[PDB]
């Protein structure tokens, strides 16, 4: 992973991309009946399985301990769903493309208490992606940065292994930074523009964290064992045999 | 503000720095009695007043509308308190320097339910600042970035004025990015190191957002009118006469 060139990093990440999933509802049946939160939860459930497979294909990620892999995914999974959603929605002003068969506006979010506020923040992020003209190659870099960065400050351990793990994570993040800069330099941007755009992109990740926190508050308020993937479920999914 | 050189931006920010405040408790009296949350709340109350004055001195900030100034401070105030705390604590491993007369360890945080988790995240951030050898000039740049960036995606308005306000904010943020790079180039870092360090610094701001969200959850759970500064209080403090 640390021996990869920028071009090789980009190719690895593009190759790792998960598929765009469809919502599971009967399109011949009335929409009034189906539960929006039910549809959204089922979609998120299925997306998480593909996210596990994607994660294992991000350079450097499988170099980490299983425990640390689980910690990183536990911290990042909702941010990763959200940046994916915002990316898919970028060319659909005023709408969130949850799936190709589930394109929702802010008014449709009003059916669930607290959801319109979340819809609005996500729509504003999609708007920002449009204003910056975010590219696919940049998007995959950002998504990988979220995976590696979101949980790296909360390991709460300074065993020798943990010190080594944190060092490796920051080395991989540095490679992704190099890659973003390389993509921008290729696009013809000046050195000033390169640094400015790097900062603009990384600063949006703070807003994505914020959205995830507001989202997790909503989910935890549901007070449900079938909501939020547990440590054990994530561990089970990541702890694969050969 | 947009005509400022990097050196002039740095000088303005260093000059704008608020003072380090002391905790209000009788040092001749027993510590067992005073309320940790009481002490922390009183400190935060007084720090916020100085934060208002600091904010007005960040280049570009008073160019914005009063409403937008209030929105930005409403979004950022706890992040700003937290980055200040982490900076003050950087050279005190295992401790949080709330004030020069109030240096607390994680065990002291245990007196309040939910506080040790917050103490731990803040201590880990201070640790990271140490690992990176964060400089004072870099710190003031980051704090100003938090002020301008934290609320810029949640204006939820596309009046002509709001479009102009968001454009100006991003122009000022670009200047601060230029300034950070200039500070790093001065320090002798290579172009690769410059971009890498810029990214490392901006990525910590996502963790600071996370901490603020966990903090605001704690404060809102207190269910108290004397906790969390209202829109009106912030408006009153910012809406100064001449
Ligand atoms: C309140 C927010 C968290 C709602 N989010 C849903 C979403 C809905 C339910 C879950 C529940 C998952 C679970 O219970 O395991 C997760 C996300 C969702 C679903 C798929 C997706 O691409 C993105 C998002 C982001 C927001 C809308
Ligand atoms: C649960 C966290 C939010 C606790 N934080 C306190 C803090 C305590 C009380 C308030 C309440 C303010 C209010 O009620 O207006 C704010 C921050 C604090 C105080 C001063 C300061 O430098 C930083 C911090 C950050 C964390 C420890």
From Swiss-Prot, chains A, B:
Lipidation (S-palmitoyl cysteine): 141
Effect of residue 233 to A: Abolishes interaction with NCOA1, NCOA2 and NCOA3
Note: Selective estrogen receptor modulators (SERMs), such as tamoxifen, raloxifene, toremifene, lasofoxifene, clomifene, femarelle and ormeloxifene, have tissue selective agonistic and antagonistic effects on the estrogen receptor (ER). They interfere with the ER association with coactivators or corepressors, mainly involving the AF-2 domain.
Residues covered by region (Interaction with AKAP13): 1-242
Stated name of the protein: Estrogen receptor
Gene from which this protein is expressed: ESR1
Disease: Estrogen resistance: A disorder characterized by partial or complete resistance to estrogens, in the presence of elevated estrogen serum levels. Clinical features include absence of the pubertal growth spurt, delayed bone maturation, unfused epiphyses, reduced bone mineral density, osteoporosis, continued growth into adulthood and very tall adult stature. Glucose intolerance, hyperinsulinemia and lipid abnormalities may also be present.
Shown part of the complete sequence: 307 to 548 of 595
UniProt note on tissues of expression: Widely expressed. Not expressed in the pituitary gland.
């Amino acid at each position: 992973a640390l021996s990869l060139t920028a071009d090789q990093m980009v190719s690895a990440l593009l190759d790792a991309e998960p598929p765009i999933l469809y919502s599971e509802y009967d399109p011949t049946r009335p929409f009034s009946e189906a539960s929006m939160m039910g549809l959204l939860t089922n979609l998120a459930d299925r997306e998480l399985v593909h996210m596990i497979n994607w994660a294992k294909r991000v350079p450097g990620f499988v170099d980490l301990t299983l425990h640390d892999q689980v910690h990183l995914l536990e911290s990042a999974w909702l941010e990763i769903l959200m940046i994916g959603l915002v990316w898919r929605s970028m060319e659909h002003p005023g709408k969130l493309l949850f799936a190709p068969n589930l394109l929702l506006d802010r008014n449709q979010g009003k059916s669930v208490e607290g959801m319109v506020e979340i819809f609005d923040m996500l729509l504003a992020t999609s708007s920002r992606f449009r204003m910056m003209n975010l590219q696919g190659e940049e998007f995959v870099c950002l998504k990988s940065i979220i995976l590696l960065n979101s949980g790296v400050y909360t390991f709460l351990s300074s065993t020798l292994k943990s010190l080594e793990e944190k060092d490796h994570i920051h080395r991989v993040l540095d490679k992704i930074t190099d890659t973003l800069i390389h993509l921008m330099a290729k696009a013809g941007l000046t050195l000033q523009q390169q640094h400015q755009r790097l900062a603009q992109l990384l600063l949006i990740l703070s807003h994505i964290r914020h959205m995830s926190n507001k989202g997790m508050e909503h989910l935890y308020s549901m007070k449900c064992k079938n909501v939020v993937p547990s440590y054990d479920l994530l561990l089970e999914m990541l702890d694969a045999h050969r």
